[model samples]
Target chain A: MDFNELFPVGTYRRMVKKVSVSDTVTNRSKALEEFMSTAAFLETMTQLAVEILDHKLPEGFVSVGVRSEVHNLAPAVLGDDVTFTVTVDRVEGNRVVLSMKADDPHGPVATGLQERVVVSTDLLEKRVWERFGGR
Target chain B: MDFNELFPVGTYRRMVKKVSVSDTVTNRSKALEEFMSTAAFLETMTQLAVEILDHKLPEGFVSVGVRSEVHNLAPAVLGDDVTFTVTVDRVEGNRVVLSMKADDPHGPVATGLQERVVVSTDLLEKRVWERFGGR
Candidate 1:
């Protein structure tokens, strides 16, 4: 399948407005640690990418690859309003690439790249069955 | 404040039952990437730790430090049920330490440590105000 066919080249934006709870921080010295979960941000970006593709798997579509280099350039505190914007930078057969950036009312907070690939559900199921003997 | 008084060292467990989504995978070859978000898992562990401590900050308590080394031992697929268990290992004046492990019915999936510190809300607020000029 041609991955490029799934999503057109353009910018996609997702606004995630929320406050930082104490649990959000990784270090007190770095308020950037208090904003949002890197994992959560990545997930949001992935969803946006999927939306751009306008495709869904038949029950299962495992992720085969992801590369993210997130830079925490600004400080974000609890109750700070933040927004994440993603752009479809490139696409190959069965693979999608996303260029992502996040900002608060102040300025840039984090930026990175996320890659995703679509796979077959039957193959994944068979592998699990072989390992666990039908659980 | 004495952090020790906040929580008596003991085992704490939280059941997070969910399946792996395609977006969760970091690499196609590594099924471990599909299971859960490292950031999300860390947040869950932190919530469990806070519950054990039985202490909540008055509006704000920034995280001072966090050190985690997670090992993804087994592969997890989409629709896999997983649970995370945490134990309080130690406590300092304002810091709490936790040992965490994750498992599916098949076997252990991940394990790591999480540390957190408590701080005052006033201090955090003042710093934010100084940075953004009261936004």
Candidate 2:
């Protein structure tokens, strides 16, 4: 699908995630309550970012993360229900910005913004090979 | 140690990370570059954020990711040197905001923001235990 065909300027998608056992980390320095870890937070955002880009990208096109900003207002436990939502923040040419938020029934989980830059796969492929020179 | 002592409103921390093999994700879905993936980039920032927070945290104290926003500007190849930097954006009581940016020798790697809320260890401990109902 083409970018225009993929989503409107304000399109949004959401996924509900249940905190898993592995979502907990043991970082002596970064560790907090046995709820969600920083890795988990980034992973969830990446998932949503890619999913949004995939459906919108045209054939032979790929999108990569350019920048993102997030806020984690509260912590969620293993069994806590977390809803992750991504909305089309803006679109400029092949560049797309997504607004993201995650929350549970009780309160806010996190809020952030992610930006992706799209490139043609053929162009990307050529750049990769050129870096190594064609044999 | 208290949140106020951990990071002043203007403290800035920087660390250079060398992407290792382990930094690469084999998964086709999440993998970006052998040198640094989004996860790895996030890890790098978390390192600085925690380091800044830890020195200020007192006994039994912990800090969690309340919200974060990041940008991945250019991909850093394996053997590439990436610099991650974090600056204190704002400090309000126990709540702290951070401005983050990443870059390589060539150009901007990423720029974003991360925020953390500091809570009293005794208060946090009480909340966690209360969730379990002292059962």
Candidate 3:
């Protein structure tokens, strides 16, 4: 079956996250570096993507590749609350494209695009085995 | 001069960003892929770091190093607003550490940590030249 035909309009979801003391480093440094290290932020985005795919696609659907470009615009401090949103944009055969955004009470924090390819578990395993010269 | 002494508690600022149509990719895939590709996210993060450092530190202060562990837990979508916050955490000698988080109305999108080293322009230039055998 054509993966693109499976998901027509696409899916959407919203996520929430909190900042902790460990998220802070130095006041004089840059904000992006600090944001990059926050486990909550990263995990939330990953979950959003996974959840969207899981809920929209078939049970056997799995990700094959991804690319992200995240930008930090403001300074997030401890106890700060953040929100992340994801939406399905395009579907090309087995490849699916998604759009994402993040924000807080202040304003826009980050935005990016991600791509994922759908594949059958058995087919994927077979391809991997063939490449590795295995069963 | 003691850099830490210069920045007592800290300063905070908010940023706003808009997700564009280009941010979208596929509907059935994950959101992180789309978020990662949006140029806005990467540029914003870099700019945030630079802005924070520039505004907080003296004119001569510059970044030497950085470390980030970003987790994409939630899905971000096009047209979504992503807010990123940065806060100064610790200061050790010439090194400064910052914590950061990203979120949207839905909730937390991603989180991570970043470290930056402060140095004098002259001192930095000399070190680079010595190491690279250049001017």
Best-matching candidate per lDDT: 2
Instruction: Please give the lDDT score at residue A6 for candidate 2.
Output: 71
**Across residues B1-135, which tens digit of lDDT does each residue of candidate 3 receive?**
576775443544447665655433322234333343322333345446556665666677666434343444454555668787766667777766666667777776655445566667676555433433423
Instruction: Report interface Cα RMSD per prediction.
Output: 6.9, 3.5, 13.6
Runs of candidate 2 exceeding 4 Å displacement: A9-12, A26-33, A105-107, A125-135, B1-12, B21-35, B128-135
Q: How well is candidate 2 docked (DockQ)?
A: 0.42
Ranking by DockQ: 2, 1, 3
Instruction: Candidate 1: give the clashing pairs.
Output: A64-B27, A64-B28, A66-B26, B19-B79, B20-B78
C-alpha local distance difference test of each model: 0.57, 0.69, 0.54
Q: Please say which candidate is ahead in DockQ: 1 or 3.
A: 1
* Cα lDDT of model 3 by residue, A67-125, tens digit: 44344444454555778887778887666677767777766655655566665656755
Sort candidate 3 into its docking category.
incorrect
**Candidate 1 DockQ, CA atoms:** 0.10
Give the range of the ten consecutive residues with the poorest summed lDDT in model 3 chain A: A31-40
For model 2, residues A49-119, the per-residue Cα lDDT tens digits are 78777755666777777666666656677688789988888887777888888888776767777777787
